[PDB]
Amino acid sequence: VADLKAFSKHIYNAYLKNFNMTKKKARSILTGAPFVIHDIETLWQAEKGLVWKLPPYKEISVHVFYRCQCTTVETVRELTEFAKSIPSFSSLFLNDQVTLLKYGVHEAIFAMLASIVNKDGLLVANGSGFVTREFLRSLRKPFSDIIEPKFEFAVKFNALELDDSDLALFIAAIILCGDRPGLMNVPRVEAIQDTILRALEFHLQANHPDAQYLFPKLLQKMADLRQLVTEHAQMMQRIKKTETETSLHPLLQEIYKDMY
Amino acid sequence: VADLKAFSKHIYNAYLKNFNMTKKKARSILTGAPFVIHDIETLWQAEKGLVWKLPPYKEISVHVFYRCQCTTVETVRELTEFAKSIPSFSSLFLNDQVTLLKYGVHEAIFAMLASIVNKDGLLVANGSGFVTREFLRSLRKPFSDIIEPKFEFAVKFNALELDDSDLALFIAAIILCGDRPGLMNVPRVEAIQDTILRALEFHLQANHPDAQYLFPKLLQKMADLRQLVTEHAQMMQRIKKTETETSLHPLLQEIYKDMY
Numbered sequence: 001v002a003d004l005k006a007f008s009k010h011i012y013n014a015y016l017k018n019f020n021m022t023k024k025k026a027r028s029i030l031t032g033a034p035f036v037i038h039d040i041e042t043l044w045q046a047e048k049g050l051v052w053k054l055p056p057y058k059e060i061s062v063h064v065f066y067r068c069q070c071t072t073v074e075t076v077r078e079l080t081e082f083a084k085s086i087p088s089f090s091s092l093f094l095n096d097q098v099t100l101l102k103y104g105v106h107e108a109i110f111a112m113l114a115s116i117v118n119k120d121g122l123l124v125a126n127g128s129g130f131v132t133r134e135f136l137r138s139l140r141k142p143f144s145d146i147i148e149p150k151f152e153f154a155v156k157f158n159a160l161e162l163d164d165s166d167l168a169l170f171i172a173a174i175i176l177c178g179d180r181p182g183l184m185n186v187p188r189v190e191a192i193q194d195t196i197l198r199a200l201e202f203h204l205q206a207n208h209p210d211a212q213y214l215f216p217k218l219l220q221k222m223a224d225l226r227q228l229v230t231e232h233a234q235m236m237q238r239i240k241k242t243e244t245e246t247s248l249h250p251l252l253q254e255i256y257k258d259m260y
Numbered sequence: 261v262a263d264l265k266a267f268s269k270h271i272y273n274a275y276l277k278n279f280n281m282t283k284k285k286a287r288s289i290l291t292g293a294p295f296v297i298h299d300i301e302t303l304w305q306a307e308k309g310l311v312w313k314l315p316p317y318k319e320i321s322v323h324v325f326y327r328c329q330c331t332t333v334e335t336v337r338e339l340t341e342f343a344k345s346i347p348s349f350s351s352l353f354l355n356d357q358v359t360l361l362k363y364g365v366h367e368a369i370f371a372m373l374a375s376i377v378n379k380d381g382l383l384v385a386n387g388s389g390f391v392t393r394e395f396l397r398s399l400r401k402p403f404s405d406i407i408e409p410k411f412e413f414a415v416k417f418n419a420l421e422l423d424d425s426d427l428a429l430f431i432a433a434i435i436l437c438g439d440r441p442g443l444m445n446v447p448r449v450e451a452i453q454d455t456i457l458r459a460l461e462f463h464l465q466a467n468h469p470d471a472q473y474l475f476p477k478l479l480q481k482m483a484d485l486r487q488l489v490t491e492h493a494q495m496m497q498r499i500k501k502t503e504t505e506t507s508l509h510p511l512l513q514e515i516y517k518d519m520y
């Protein structure tokens with residue numbers, strides 16, 4: 001319908017408004033330049049100005065973990081603003097908005113990760129840096145363990161060849177999940193999500209006319225993301241317990257507090 | 261200072277904006293008319309149009325309890341809007357805004373109750389009804405038990421002879437408490453509260469020049485309110501467990517969920 005077309009483009013513009021790094025920009029950068037971070041000395045150089053311009057850390061692995069936290073916390077703030085633009089999200093009681101974000105932002109974050117990833121690494125600092133996967137693999141347990149599964153997910157996710165207009169609806173659908181623990185107005189949320197998902201099905205058909213089964217494949221990706229984040233949360237809670245000298249940003253603490 | 265004077269008047273206007281029933285209006289109505297609800301048949305008449313124009317109930321006590329819930333849920337919504345007008349409250353992360361409201365709205369509600377109370381009853385439905393205390397006392401345990409302590413608090417509170425401009429700062433100070441369980445940015449909240457409280461001390465001195473110790477007496481009232489609401493929450497959780505056929509509004513369920 002033309003509502004669904006108008007709805008999709010509204011969500012897309014909210015996405016363009018709230019996330020500076022898009023898949024389109026990242027793909028232009030990746031295909032052809034970013035400074036390559038691939039060891040401790042190029043990380044130092046990157047911090048010295050080439051890429052970037054952090055609680056005290058004692059090892060490279062925790063230092064990288066802290067950069068991870070900086071970026072995800074920023075992306076949580078962007079997603080909160082984005083969600084305010086999803087029709088009827090702001091009509092929910094504030095505590096439901098908080099529950100939806102608490103349980104959805106990291107699913108959305110690890111979906112958006114694929115936009116800035118190739119099989120060899122990811123873009124950092126707004127395209128100006130590229131961190132190699134093989135360097136992240138060089139970090140110690142459990143930081144390498146919490147990183148690599150996200151690459152695996154992301155490279156498979158990129159096989160679907162989504163673009164930003166698809167992703168904007170996908171992320172909105174992730175945030176508006178009616179089965180989050182402790183929601184109050186489950187039917188409200190479900191209805192909003194159903195509007196988003198019908199818009200997504202339509203948009204995918206218009207945008208990828210020759211792609212068969214793309215919509216159910218994306219619904220499956222949503223479930224895979226839930227599982228990915230469940231296991232992520234498990235590793236973050238564990239790191240909190242075992243890695244006493246490693247800091248968690250208080251927003252991430254709150255998100256993982258009593259999660260799953 | 262004149263900041264503190266400007267701050268106080270900003271909070272006052274936010275209060276005038278968000279709560280239709282003020283102490284000033286209620287005192288004009290009480291002093292001299294509202295329809296008097298004092299038994300089951302005058303409650304029926306009031307519902308028939310004289311005052312009002314509810315999940316299914318089987319007894320007068322639960323029916324009154326449901327009216328209680330209607331009003332408090334409305335007042336929670338007004339307080340949420342009010343809080344958005346307290347300087348820097350909206351700058352807090354959404355989850356902290358939710359924690360502050362969760363733990364503060366009923367303290368604020370049972371403070372504001374005194375505005376519409378005299379020793380004989382309270383105003384309902386925007387001054388058009390007056391429910392007698394002795395009728396509320398006629399309800400069965402535990403509804404009479406959850407009602408009477410609020411009257412006792414309120415009549416003592418009215419002995420302080422606060423007016424609406426005092427109350428607006430008092431309620432703001434209640435919402436901005438830095439010791440709520442689970443807050444993230446405790447120092448932020450404390451600082452905002454300290455601004456509110458210095459404004460309150462100033463405002464009280466300007467408004468009640470001959471009242472000695474009024475400010476520490478109000479701080480004590482805040483602690484008394486915390487205790488009142490702690491015990492209230494205990495009785496609501498108990499009613500939830502023992503009174504299986506009695507409904508709780510899902511917002512009240514969320515507020516009392518894991519409270520104290």
Ligand SMILES: O=C(O)CCCCCOc1ccccc1Cn1c(-c2ccc(OC(F)(F)F)cc2)nc2ccccc21
Binds near residue numbers: 067
């Ligand atoms: O659970 C939390 O919320 C905090 C902990 C998250 C830990 C795992 O995170 C990742 C896992 C795989 C790939 C990338 C990231 C972090 N990740 C980064 C990133 C990675 C490393 C960085 O630093 C260094 F390597 F030194 F450049 C800086 C940013 N950008 C991202 C953009 C979108 C999504 C994720 C992004």
Ligand SMILES: O=C(O)CCCCCOc1ccccc1Cn1c(-c2ccc(OC(F)(F)F)cc2)nc2ccccc21
Binds near residue numbers: 323329406410
């Ligand atoms: O914990 C929750 O959130 C829900 C349960 C609350 C139970 C106890 O509540 C009260 C206790 C004492 C006095 C008044 C009220 C409710 N209370 C009423 C009220 C009372 C009775 C009513 O109904 C009837 F009596 F039939 F008219 C309707 C409204 N107005 C209020 C205005 C401000 C503050 C409280 C007000």
